[PDB]
Amino acid sequence: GKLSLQDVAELIRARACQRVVVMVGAGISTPSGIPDFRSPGSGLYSNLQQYDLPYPEAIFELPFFFHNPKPFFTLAKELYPGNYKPNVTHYFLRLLHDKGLLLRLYTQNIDGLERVSGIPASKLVEAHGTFASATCTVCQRPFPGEDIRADVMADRVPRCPVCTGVVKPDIVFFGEPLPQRFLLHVVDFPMADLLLILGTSLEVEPFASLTEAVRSSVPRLLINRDLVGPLAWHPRSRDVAQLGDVVHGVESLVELLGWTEEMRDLVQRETGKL
Ligand SMILES: [Zn+2]
């Protein structure tokens, strides 16, 4: 006796699941046009070859930042809040929160679109960082993202007002440790009664183990093109796959919840405010 997408949809309507924990990846955002800087062809990829990086991933290396910050900041300009807007996927999660069901949303994305869709900070774990804030590389003072917005959009490298050091946005670089809020997972996953995995393979650790971190009786809804990861290898009876386009699978569950109108309604107000 498996479950189906409607099954879950009805567990949320009946509110037999009311402490939902969601995990999202790159897949929920490419609908909003977030360009993969890794993939050639995208505009951002083009601008990055202009420099002397040995590979695209070296923007996220501290060495090949303090050597030249400009490559990173080229990404920074492209992703900096406002330039893109959230899609139906983020908004389902916005809604899921407003309806009081959202325990925590753990994201691997840096587009901060979870923020913009209107989910409060307390609900978010931006495990790979955010452009929302920054920190002086030298004097360690933090800065709200607006202060470096001026220099960033104008291709200048923002130096600190007190000491003139580089003000690096709070993006997690390879090698630096994951943000402190990631450690909420000790309490969130044991209290989660529903796990929701959208648009990512959960292949990189330590997120891969988190999927097995809900109690056994908890259903895990996956919505992704493929079926891989700890959901493929070690599945559970309570699991539900929704393979294919994420946007579509999101809409199908918004339907089966009967929210499809309330969703179009949210999409209305929040598109105007942007
Ligand atoms: Zn400083």
Residue numbers in the entry: 121 to 394
Manuscript text:
We can conclude, however, that the key elements for Sirt1 inhibition by AROS are present in the generic Sirtuin catalytic core that is shared by all isoforms, and that we can thus exploit other isoforms as model systems for structural and mechanistic studies on its interaction with AROS. We solved a crystal structure of Sirt3 in complex with a peptide AROS 62-71 at 3.27 Å resolution. The structure was refined to Rcryst/Rfree values of 20.2/26.1%. The electron density revealed the Arg-Lys-Arg motif of the peptide ligand to be bound to the substrate binding groove, with AROS Lys65 in the active site pocket for the substrate acetyl-lysine, packed between His248 and Phe180/294. Arg66 is stacked upon Phe294, and Arg64 interacts with the mainchain oxygen of Leu298. Beyond these three AROS residues, the ligand is not well defined by electron density and appears to be flexible, without major contact with the Sirtuin. Comparing the complex to other Sirtuin/peptide complexes (Sirt3/ACS2, Sirt5/IDH2, Sirt1/p53) confirms that both types of ligands share the more closed Sirtuin conformation generally observed for Sirtuin/substrate complexes and the high conservation of residues interacting with the visible core motif of the respective ligand. The comparison indicates only subtle differences in the local Sirtuin conformation (small rotations of Sirt3 His248 and Phe294), likely caused by the Lys acylation of substrate peptides. The only significant difference between the AROS motif and a substrate appears to be the side-chain position of AROS-Arg66, which appears to occupy the pocket normally accommodating the backbone of one or two additional defined residues and thereby supports AROS binding and its ability to compete with physiological substrates.
